[PDB]
């Protein structure tokens, strides 16, 4: 089997502040992506990694434009994971001061997938976005996005600071939009694809179970 991994993180401004009693979603999801990158590193799984640290104070993307596909810096294209990428995640990341949409980054990562997953053989794809739902986004291509996600066999998961079981009306409407989007991907079961961050820690702290085919 083969898989393609494209992790999408935001480096905006809202995550730069949070409750003093809990770590910021920036550093929280930072440890998460660090611990997660470690997971597919040690396992010799042939999964390929690309990273999208959107919400960038600059813009370094193959689809650079004045307003279309803006504020995006793909850390590295879709290839095998390796240590120096983990270290550069640990160091190169910097707190931001901007705010940017994710759906934009979703399409950008989508295009990377379509531009590379046919270029080399794969079997299945994921797309993961970590964010705090503090973006100004339009629901335009959502139907088309979900369409060609279905067509290219790309599975979308969202990871949000709040827990399903006090967030902004911006965050709340983003959450409702996210529920709409996930149901538009799979259906009612799309609720499970919602993920918070503490639960990510609890469910992910272990290293990768050493699976073995008989």
């Amino acid at each position: 089997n083969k898989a393609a991994v494209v992790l999408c993180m935001d480096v905006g401004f809202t995550m730069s502040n949070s409750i003093p009693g809990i770590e910021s979603p920036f550093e929280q999801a930072k440890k998460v992506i660090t611990m997660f990158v470690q997971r597919q590193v040690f396992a010799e799984n042939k999964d390929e990694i690309a990273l999208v640290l959107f919400g960038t104070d600059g813009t370094d993307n193959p689809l650079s434009g004045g307003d279309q596909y803006q504020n995006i810096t793909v850390h590295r294209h879709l290839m095998l994971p390796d240590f120096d990428l983990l270290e550069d995640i640990e160091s190169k990341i910097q707190p931001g001061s901007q705010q940017a949409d994710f759906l934009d980054a979703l399409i950008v990562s989508m295009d990377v997938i379509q531009h590379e997953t046919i270029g080399k053989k794969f079997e299945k794809r994921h797309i993961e976005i970590f964010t705090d739902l503090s973006s100004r986004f339009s629901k335009s291509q959502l139907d088309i996005i979900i369409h060609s996600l279905k067509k290219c066999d790309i599975s979308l998961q969202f990871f949000l600071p709040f827990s399903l079981g006090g967030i902004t009306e911006q965050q709340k409407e983003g959450l409702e939009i996210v529920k709409m989007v996930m149901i538009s991907l799979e259906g009612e079961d799309g609720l499970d694809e919602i993920y918070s961050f503490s639960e990510s820690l609890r469910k992910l702290c272990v290293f990768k179970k050493i699976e073995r085919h008989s």
Partner: peptide, 7 residues
């Protein structure tokens, strides 16, 4: 089943 970030 766990998928993507979990698979």
């Amino acid at each position: 089943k766990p998928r993507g970030l979990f698979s």
